[PDB]
């Protein structure tokens, strides 16, 4: 169905300059913001594996075709949990989301409450998986 609405949005998080296509650079930066260090070669292998046209960029229709686990998440958690204490504070949550692509404390504290099962005011690993595995 129109779940193509979630992929379109996912596509837009990558298609940063919104020119309709994802490039090698534009892919590397998002992957870096999430704790990875892909090489330039890996950035063209991945694109070309989705790039059916022969351009070097991925447009939405191509992206959709492609779009149709612990370590990636445990790795994301560590990007969030900047001081590695097992808890994502409200400060760390801001710092990382503004690095992921975002500019308030009502927006951040709403985030915490939306996943704060035990109610301690911060986000642990367990609570983290819940918001990543939908």
């Amino acid at each position: 169905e129109e779940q193509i609405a979630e992929f379109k949005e996912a596509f837009s998080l990558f298609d940063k300059d919104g020119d309709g296509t994802i490039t090698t650079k534009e892919l590397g930066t998002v992957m870096r913001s999430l704790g990875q260090n892909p090489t330039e070669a890996e950035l063209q292998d991945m694109i070309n594996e989705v790039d059916a046209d022969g351009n070097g960029t991925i447009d939405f229709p191509e992206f959709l075709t492609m779009m149709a686990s612990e370590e990636e998440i445990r790795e994301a958690f560590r990007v969030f949990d900047k001081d590695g204490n097992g808890y994502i504070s409200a400060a760390e949550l801001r710092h990382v989301m503004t690095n992921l692509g975002e500019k308030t404390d009502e927006e951040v504290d709403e985030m915490i409450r939306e996943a704060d099962i035990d109610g301690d005011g911060q986000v642990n690993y367990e609570e983290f998986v819940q918001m990543m595995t939908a």
Binding site: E6, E9, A10, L13, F14, L27, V30, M31, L34, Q36, E42, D45, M46, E49, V50, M66, M67, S69, E72, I73, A76, M97, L100, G101, E102, E107, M111, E114, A115, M131, M132, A134
Partner: peptide
């Protein structure tokens, strides 16, 4: 809104890219 759907989307897409790379 939902800063979390955004994060989840990015993470999950990056994982799929890693996958197509390995498949």
């Amino acid at each position: 809104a939902s800063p979390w759907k955004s994060a989840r989307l990015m993470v999950h897409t990056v994982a799929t890219f890693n996958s197509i790379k390995e498949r």
